[PDB]
């Protein structure tokens, strides 16, 4: 009935503090397709977040690539918060420049 989303949070390009980049939040293996994905900077929702179009894989599971423009710094924190019906609570994954 329900499959729990797998999440990866990472930058499009290798990060350098001060340099504009693109932060990705790749969410996969979830069902049903309705899902709420948001990106956070220091705990605050980021306004402009792009999302790829609805797509599913061979095992019928859905996946989405959400991304937003961002500039990594030594101090700011970035995370993706995913809320889906297959989980009691929303799930928050932090961006780690080493991954």
């Amino acid at each position: 009935i329900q499959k729990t989303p797998q999440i990866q949070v990472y930058s499009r390009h290798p990060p350098e503090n001060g340099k504009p980049n693109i932060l990705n939040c790749y969410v996969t293996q979830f069902h049903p397709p309705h899902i709420e994905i948001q990106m956070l900077k220091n705990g605050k929702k980021i306004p402009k977040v792009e999302m790829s179009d609805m797509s599913f894989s061979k095992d019928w599971s859905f996946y989405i690539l959400a991304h937003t423009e961002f500039t990594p710094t030594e101090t700011d924190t970035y995370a993706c918060r995913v809320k889906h019906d297959s989980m009691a609570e929303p799930k928050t994954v932090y961006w780690d420049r080493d991954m």
Binding site: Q8, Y10, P32, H34, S55, F56, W60, S61, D98
Partner: protein, 275 residues
């Protein structure tokens, strides 16, 4: 070489009076090339790859009309299913379909596909003989009987051996220099903090296309299949992919380890080391 075409269709009902949303996505060699979404302002099949711009308006009109029909068909089937499974109105439901063909190395039809899922689970599927069906549960057995009586398989079989194949050949011709392109991965190794004299070495592969790839760490050039950390291949968002593999190493012994990267775009596999 081996190739394939596939149409992935999805229909989701939603609480209220609102009708279901229908989305159809076409692929050729696993690359999206057309798309229709009933949620759009003026719902129509649209090219999703430069090479599809070659198709004239009669094609887009025909395809869009086929999709308008599919939208209704899914509306009806979703309703039928609520009855088979004894479900009340007012819930969210999902019906999915995958159809298409795989060509063999001889470019002839290797296998036809036509399956459905409901609530994300296998529902019914046409067997390889393209004559008989495999129903996944009791409800689907209702569909199976209904379709054996109607001869539904013959309709799909003609499509899978005729149209699917003819049009796949045409698409491969029009998108020659595109589906066959490759982008070699640009790789580098990062070094991360020693948990008591132990450091993590991470091998990154970036900007590659297609997504198939293999990263392998070695010690003195000798295999190291065992204690290696991997990550699922991921989209960069620009059309290329990324992946990394790491391994725990004794601080001061990192010059011994090398990371091997294998990919079709590469003239030879890549070999990297920390620094």
């Amino acid at each position: 070489g081996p190739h394939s075409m596939r149409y992935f269709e999805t229909a989701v009902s939603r609480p209220g009076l609102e009708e279901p949303r229908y989305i159809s996505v076409g692929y050729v060699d696993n690359k999206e090339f057309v798309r229709f979404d009933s949620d759009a302002e003026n719902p129509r099949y649209e090219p999703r790859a430069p090479w599809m711009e070659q198709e004239g308006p009669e094609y887009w009109e025909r395809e869009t009309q086929k999709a308008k029909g599919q939208e209704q068909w899914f509306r009806v089937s979703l309703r039928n299913l609520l009855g088979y499974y004894n479900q009340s109105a007012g819930g969210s439901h999902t019906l999915q379909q995958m159809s298409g063909c795989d060509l063999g190395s001889d470019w002839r039809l290797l296998r036809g596909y036509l399956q459905f899922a409901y609530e994300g689970r296998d529902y019914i599927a046409l067997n390889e003989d393209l004559k008989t069906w495999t129903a996944a549960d009791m409800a689907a057995q209702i569909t199976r009987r209904k379709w054996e009586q109607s001869g539904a398989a013959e309709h799909y079989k003609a499509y899978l051996e005729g149209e699917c194949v003819e049009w796949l050949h045409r698409y491969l011709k029009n998108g020659n220099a595109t589906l066959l392109r490759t982008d070699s991965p640009k790789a580098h190794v990062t070094h991360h903090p020693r948990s008591k004299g132990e450091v993590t070495l991470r091998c990154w592969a970036l900007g590659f296309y297609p997504a198939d790839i293999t990263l392998t760490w070695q010690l003195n050039g000798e295999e190291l299949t065992q204690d290696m950390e991997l990550v699922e291949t991921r989209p960069a968002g620009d059309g290329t992919f990324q992946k990394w593999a790491s391994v725990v190493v004794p601080l001061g012994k990192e010059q011994n380890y090398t990371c091997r990267v294998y990919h079709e775009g590469l003239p030879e596999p890549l070999t990297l080391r920390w620094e």
